[PDB]
């Protein structure tokens, strides 16, 4: 039988939008746990629901998108408050709110009065990034993420104020009940999404178990730390009302390596480009090099997205490898052995944070960015001091393994 | 400005559907090249357009989906003819055709007469897999792939016959011109998609250059070889009218390793499960182990999809590693050295082909399958002879590297 579906039912049934709709093994799943005034990034060796993490992610990247959008403007985003308590998830930013105004074409379609936040939250393929510029470094592009959050919410509340009015709209039952909004005068300016996911439909206990709750809190806490490193310097990231410590890639590196390699040496670099638009967006990099690292490992926040695959990583890997091979054959008086990238890089843990204009993704989840490798070969340069430091640490480890 | 988009314009502008819409560096890009009656899988070190390869892939996986759907039936798919010539791309299968019948709800929506092939090819989120069963091993799930092919076609022709009628419909200008279909009597039974992509819009020369043409032909030829290993035994896969040789994972392994390691030993296993539905779908595996392999490498055809990431790989990796560590500490009289998965597996090239029921993906592209790791720990077993052979080859290589 041949069936025609709408966005709503499709997004509830299909994994192409946010990942699997039940618990699966997520490789590299991490969370932040507090051990006596110390943040540690630890693995979560338990299956979780990718789509569940995506609905947090979509709203968080919407907030960091607003922050970049306003950072060179008069009214800026000074904070991103994220909270997670008793299952309820909330995110609030303070730049200009979403325009409290009637959407003409959306109302013509709906045959009733529809305002912009209702389009932004309930209309698939809708937003301000349908026509993205080549220089735009927002993560958002599809006009889909927010509605993915709504469709996986038992209940949700969009609140937004623009300095003259406040606008409150309830969106319930997986986008099936869209209450008419309530518009009052207010002089506040902010955007807040507040929602309860459908934890049971997504494979979780109702309410969340002790372990599920702790795992999800740790994961969200981690995402907030990542924002705090990516976001600009006038913006505080809060999670459950505490500010997020990690405003630098060095802080992120220390967090991820607190256990494998405490008290270790952090190689740092700011990778710059010479031609606009790339020269507008330096990449911050911190790397630790340890013999007790078993494989190569990276953490990337690119355009606010915690993506796990992309040619920026390969750019750093290949550059470091070429230098490592040169100095290994120099330092070794054996002069015959041939090492490759796995030997070069398996003792490296690296953090890369920043914006890259003009990238594309392999799906809505934005797990993998898509780019020509030559973008980096043409435009970017890794500072030689960082390369030298790194090569030195790595060749030390190689020579001692063959010692 | 807040914009509302339709499927058509969205799919032309957005990379979430099929990948990047221009040329990017695709890691692991391979193609099949003929060298004097020998097929070799060689890297393509040139940027290509992921969405362009996806429109070939979508139709090819639709065909292998039909093949699985009909394999236990009376009228089977006996062939999948694929061709690529002068830019035109074509794919034809011979099971029962697409129902030549009026679609009621689609006609009610369109306010005119719409037949099932027009829904199948022009209506997003539409198909026979909107409600997939947990045991279904077709790649198709979203009701999207075929329309992605149409939207990236300057012109296309859907032809399908059901044994009493033939149905010809033209779909042109990136799904903007949908000509009314032409229905005649015929006693043939088949489905054919024939189309010209928008190579210029996707970053290519018009017409294709010598290198682009050769790269794309090699890549499609490779995909067909993969089908020929995945498809059932009554089904011939043709590419440009020649049959595709590689009906076994051993043939695939030899093709991929013809240069790095000719005349090499191929470890083979059929990984079975004991509980339905998994016991209905054995995984075929072929692996080569060579000192001149620089990193771990796999080729996977799962449910007809050439996916590149999934916990099936990790299942094999971890099992082989546990055995390799045991026998390494046994064979070594050093008895202290500790090796991990990278040491265990960096000399392995492995092919895994077959069906897995109940999997999910991370996006439409289906680059990565999503599953609980325990599915394999509970249900599947790797034959011990294969594990033993593999461990032996690997420990030989490790002992000679430390020799
Ligand atoms: N916190 C926010 N502050 C301001 N505007 C917002 C905020 N969240 C969402 N928006 C607006 O709502 C629109 C719709 O959001 P969304 O559905 O996530 O699409 P998107 O972020 O543009 N692209 P994508 O996330 O890739 O689907 C966005 O384009 C923004 O214009
Ligand atoms: N070669 C074919 N033979 C028979 N039926 C086909 C063939 N190609 C397509 N169809 C039918 O057309 C429908 C629509 O195709 P498609 O748009 O690719 O969706 P899908 O394959 O079901 N799921 P997806 O590919 O993940 O978007 C399919 O569900 C099939 O029922
Ligand atoms: Mg968004
Ligand atoms: Mg399909």
């Amino acid at each position: 039988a041949f069936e025609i579906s709408d966005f709503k039912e499709h997004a509830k049934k299909k994994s192409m939008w946010a990942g699997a709709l039940n618990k699966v093994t997520i490789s590299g799943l991490m969370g932040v746990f507090t051990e006596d005034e110390d943040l540690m990034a630890l693995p979560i060796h338990r299956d979780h629901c990718p789509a569940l993490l995506k609905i947090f992610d979509e709203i968080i990247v919407n907030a960091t998108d607003h922050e970049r959008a306003c950072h060179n403007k008069t009214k800026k985003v000074t904070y991103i408050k994220i909270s997670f308590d008793k299952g309820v998830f909330s995110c609030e930013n303070d730049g200009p709110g979403i325009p409290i105004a009637k959407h003409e074409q959306a109302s013509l379609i709906a045959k009733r009065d529809v305002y912009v936040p209702e389009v932004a939250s309930c209309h698939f393929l809708a937003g301000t990034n349908i026509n993205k510029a080549k220089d735009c470094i927002k993560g958002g592009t599809n006009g889909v993420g927010l509605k993915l959050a709504m469709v996986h919410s038992q209940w949700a509340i969009l609140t937004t104020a623009d300095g003259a009015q406040k606008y409150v709209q309830h969106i319930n039952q997986r986008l099936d009940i869209i209450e008419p909004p309530t518009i009052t005068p207010s002089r506040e300016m902010f955007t807040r999404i507040e929602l309860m996911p459908v934890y049971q439909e997504l494979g979780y206990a109702e309410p969340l178990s002790e372990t599920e709750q702790a795992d999800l809190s740790a994961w969200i806490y981690l995402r907030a730390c990542q924002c705090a490193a990516y976001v600009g310097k006038g913006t505080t990231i809060y999670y459950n009302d505490k500010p997020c410590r990690t405003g630098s890639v060095m802080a992120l590196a220390k967090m991820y390596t607190l256990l494998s390699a405490p008290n270790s040496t952090i190689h740092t670099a700011t990778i710059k480009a010479d031609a606009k638009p790339y020269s507008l967006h330096p990449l911050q990099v911190a790397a630790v090099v340890s013999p007790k690292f078993k494989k190569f490992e990276h953490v990337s926040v690119i355009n606010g997205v915690n993506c796990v695959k992309g040619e920026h990583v390969t750019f750093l890997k290949k550059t470091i490898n070429e230098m490592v091979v040169k100095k290994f054959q120099q330092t070794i008086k054996d002069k015959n052995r041939k090492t490759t990238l796995r030997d070069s890089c398996s003792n490296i843990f690296i953090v890369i944070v920043g914006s890259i204009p003009g990238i594309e993704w392999t799906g809505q989840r934005k797990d993998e960015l898509s780019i020509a490798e030559n973008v980096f070969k043409t435009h970017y340069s890794i500072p030689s001091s960082f390369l030298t430091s790194m090569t030195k640490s790595i060749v030390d480890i190689l020579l001692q393994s063959i010692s």
Side-chain angles (χ1 to χ4, degrees), chain A:
Chain A
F2 274 77
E3 326 220 43
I4 297 168
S5 197
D6 55 298
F7 289 110
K8 234 155 49 178
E9 304 290 303
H10 206 271
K12 306 191 265 233
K13 288 167 179 161
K14 296 313 176 171
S15 72
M16 64 160 275
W17 299 102
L21 299 153
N22 274 105
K23 300 215 253 225
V24 299
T25 307
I26 305 179
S27 199
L29 190 61
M30 309 275 286
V32 162
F33 306 81
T34 294
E35 190 95 317
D36 278 329
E37 303 108 29
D38 262 346
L39 306 176
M40 316 157 35
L42 270 38
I44 301 162
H45 298 299
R46 275 168 307 282
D47 291 353
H48 276 274
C49 175
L52 177 61
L53 308 190
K54 259 307 150 173
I55 65 185
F56 309 144
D57 191 48
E58 292 290 351
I59 295 156
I60 292 172
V61 175
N62 281 340
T64 72
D65 281 353
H66 203 43
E67 187 274 315
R68 309 316 297 133
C70 300
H71 87 265
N72 289 337
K73 308 267 171 282
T74 190
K75 282 257 182 324
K76 299 179 171 59
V77 178
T78 82
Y79 68 83
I80 304 177
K81 277 165 163 104
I82 300 156
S83 58
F84 179 71
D85 179 35
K86 317 212 150 301
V88 191
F89 168 86
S90 147
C91 187
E92 174 184 317
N93 61 258
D94 75 317
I98 302 192
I100 299 168
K102 178 202 205 91
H103 206 269
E104 231 289 334
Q105 155 204 9
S107 300
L108 275 52
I109 292 167
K111 223 94 65 198
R112 66 161 155 93
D113 286 13
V114 176
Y115 293 78
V116 169
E118 192 182 326
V119 186
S121 47
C122 308
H123 203 126
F124 281 75
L125 321 178
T128 54
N129 302 298
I130 304 301
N131 296 312
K132 208 164 176 73
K134 161 42 208 313
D135 64 299
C136 172
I137 50 93
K138 296 195 225 138
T141 180
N142 293 316
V144 162
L146 185 36
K147 305 87 190 185
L148 288 187
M150 300 303 103
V151 83
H152 298 310
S153 301
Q154 224 190 293
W155 62 260
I157 302 160
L158 191 147
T159 304
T160 193
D162 64 24
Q165 301 165 112
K166 175 237 61 161
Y167 173 112
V168 170
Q169 184 160 45
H170 283 13
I171 295 122
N172 303 316
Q173 274 197 43
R174 310 192 79 168
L175 266 174
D176 287 17
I177 313 305
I178 293 161
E179 319 277 358
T182 290
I183 292 154
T184 61
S186 190
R187 294 183 181 277
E188 291 164 294
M189 214 180 281
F190 71 96
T191 307
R192 181 159 75 240
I193 313 304
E194 185 186 359
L195 61 89
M196 177 85 82
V198 288
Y199 296 111
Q200 212 172 58
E201 308 287 333
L202 295 175
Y204 291 75
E206 159 166 303
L208 290 167
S209 67
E210 174 254 302
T211 301
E212 294 164 337
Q213 161 71 38
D215 286 348
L216 290 167
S217 178
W219 182 96
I220 302 171
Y221 195 3
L222 188 37
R223 267 307 264 136
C225 295
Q226 292 173 2
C227 298
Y230 173 82
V231 84
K233 281 185 238 141
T235 301
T236 315
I237 299 318
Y238 302 90
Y239 173 63
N240 287 342
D241 304 296
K242 317 271 257 173
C244 284
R245 212 34 180 174
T246 61
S248 84
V249 289
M250 303 71 81
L252 257 57
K254 168 158 160 191
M255 180 164 69
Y256 278 89
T257 60
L258 199 34
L259 267 82
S260 34
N263 310 129
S264 42
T265 284
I266 301 173
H267 310 255
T268 73
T270 303
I271 301 147
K272 289 169 175 160
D274 273 313
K276 281 169 66 190
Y278 306 98
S279 60
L280 304 177
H281 308 298
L283 291 182
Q284 307 296 328
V285 161
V288 184
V289 164
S290 173
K292 23 188 57 178
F293 292 172
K294 312 332 308 209
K295 72 192 211 286
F296 177 81
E297 214 91 272
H298 79 96
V299 176
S300 295
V301 173
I302 302 298
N303 294 357
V305 180
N306 189 25
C307 68
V308 299
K309 186 173 183 180
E311 290 289 334
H312 58 303
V313 174
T314 298
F315 173 57
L316 276 146
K317 263 175 120 170
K318 286 180 166 165
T319 302
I320 293 169
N321 173 64
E322 291 186 299
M323 253 206 73
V324 160
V325 175
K326 236 184 289 214
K327 218 101 72 192
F328 190 56
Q329 292 158 345
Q330 292 333 324
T331 302
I332 216 176
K333 281 75 170 179
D334 179 31
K335 310 268 244 295
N336 282 341
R337 156 72 160 145
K338 329 184 178 214
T339 57
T340 59
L341 275 304
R342 181 177 65 83
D343 299 317
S344 283
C345 291
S346 47
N347 309 293
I348 305 171
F349 171 84
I350 170 151
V351 175
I352 316 155
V353 176
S355 294
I356 306 177
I359 62 175
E360 301 187 61
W361 312 95
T362 60
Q364 165 71 33
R365 284 189 39 88
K366 303 174 188 124
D367 295 314
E368 173 184 1
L369 68 87
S370 305
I371 187 96
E373 56 182 346
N374 290 353
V375 167
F376 313 100
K377 304 191 181 175
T378 288
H379 288 315
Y380 287 74
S381 79
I382 300 142
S384 66
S385 70
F386 167 84
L387 289 169
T388 291
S389 281
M390 291 286 280
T391 302
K392 262 174 158 147
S393 273
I394 300 165
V395 171
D396 275 4
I397 288 170
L398 303 185
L399 298 159
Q400 97 193 125
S401 94
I402 288 105
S403 190

